Write a protein that binds this ligand. Structure first.
Ligand SMILES: Nc1ncnc2c1ncn2[C@@H]1O[C@H](CSCC[C@H](N)C(=O)O)[C@@H](O)[C@H]1O
Ligand SMILES: Nc1ncnc2c1ncn2[C@@H]1O[C@H](CSCC[C@H](N)C(=O)O)[C@@H](O)[C@H]1O
Lengths: 212, 218
């Protein structure tokens, strides 16, 4: 069984992935995804989640007192706390495999310039904390990153959801003047495998030379 | 003014586009985002969008005929056709800057094992086509990739407006749970604050992303 708790100021962002879980998996207790509005843990009538950065400059920083109360309530000693951030370690398929056998993931979704660093520092003294980037681009908030992480992790949990793969084809054999490569129809399955390997090599050279 | 069309067999999965920054840019009229159900272009009783691969292998491939009809209707020669795929060129901040100047993005979201390669090949005979990966992991579908791409592009479009990681940030109170904000940040010395932030950035980068500074990855 896996529990995923997401904490966010935009809880509606995660509702479609919640509803996408198959009922059989939920009923079997294989997976439970819960979403929490961070504003439940604000202190003031204005429900403030952010404040000006120490040292100056633009933007805002999310408040440690609010996040600290949220994580105190949601996390336990078994929690793996995931903090999406463009300044994080890379989230990769290896990470997804590792996290797919965790009992409890908590995803803390940030906004503005991120979460006051003492939140992660303090949490790390009582649980495991993982600051991760999903790619070399900047989002406005952690919610889209949470969606990517949830999808990549949960498709590796049974019954829930080096070289590049080459092109794929289906019927019809000829379409808009373009034929499916005839080798694929040849019934020479060793040759087909070699053809696919060369297609993957060429595609990796063209698109991802870093991988070779 | 930008137009983004998203084509998917799961249109409800794109509802998050109405939240947060993409939602506000939608409300401000700077961008119009339309989501289309690919099954609208099917003709059979069962609305079939997939068929088994040629050459063997597991899974299913999205049929070219249905996609070709959809893109015929939605795209023009001016369109930038975005095809998310883990086998694509990397989508990066540079890509986001480039696409932020485009008049029309169409995002073709795959499912199953992906879309028959001739769909992209055919589209490229009349428009620009970009097959892109959003990262070194595997999603079940292109819908989450579309949301990432839309968010990263929309925050750059004029009307809403480096090679290093940003260091840590702090806000009030100055002491919390016995944990202090670094004193330099409280000191008011702008030059010492700038130098500390630059050092924190470079130290975080070599620890977390040594590749960005030209060092081996672990
Ligand atoms: N590449 C990425 N990977 C994971 N999370 C990201 C991300 N890019 C942005 N985020 C999320 O979005 C939040 C704000 S981005 C932080 C800086 C600010 N957006 C700016 O540059 O002006 C982050 O704290 C993180 O939660
Ligand atoms: N890293 C990534 N970047 C962009 N899109 C991705 C992606 N991973 C998955 N997708 C999307 O999800 C769809 C199905 S994944 C495609 C099959 C894959 N070879 C597999 O291992 O099963 C793709 O066609 C693409 O639209």
């Amino acid at each position: 069984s896996m529990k995923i708790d997401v904490v966010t100021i935009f809880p509606e962002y995660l509702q479609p992935v919640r509803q996408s879980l198959p009922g059989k998996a939920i009923d079997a207790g294989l997976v439970d995804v819960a979403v929490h509005d961070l504003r439940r843990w604000t202190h003031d009538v204005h429900k403030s989640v952010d404040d000006s950065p120490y040292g100056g400059g633009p933007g805002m920083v999310m408040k440690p007192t609010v996040w600290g109360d949220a994580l105190d309530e949601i996390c336990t000693s078994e929690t793996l706390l995931v903090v999406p951030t463009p300044a994080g370690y890379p989230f990769t398929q290896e990470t997804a495999w590792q996290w797919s056998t965790e009992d409890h993931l908590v995803i803390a979704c940030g906004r503005y310039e991120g979460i006051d660093q003492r939140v992660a520092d303090d949490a790390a003294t009582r649980m495991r904390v993982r600051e991760v980037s999903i790619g070399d681009y900047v989002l406005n908030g952690g919610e889209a990153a949470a969606l990517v992480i949830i999808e990549a992790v949960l498709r590796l949990v049974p019954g829930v959801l080096s070289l590049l793969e080459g092109p794929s084809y289906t019927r019809p054999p000829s379409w808009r003047g373009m034929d499916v490569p005839p080798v694929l129809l040849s019934g020479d399955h060793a040759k087909i495998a070699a053809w696919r390997a060369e297609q993957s090599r060429q595609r990796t050279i063209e698109r991802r030379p870093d991988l070779l």
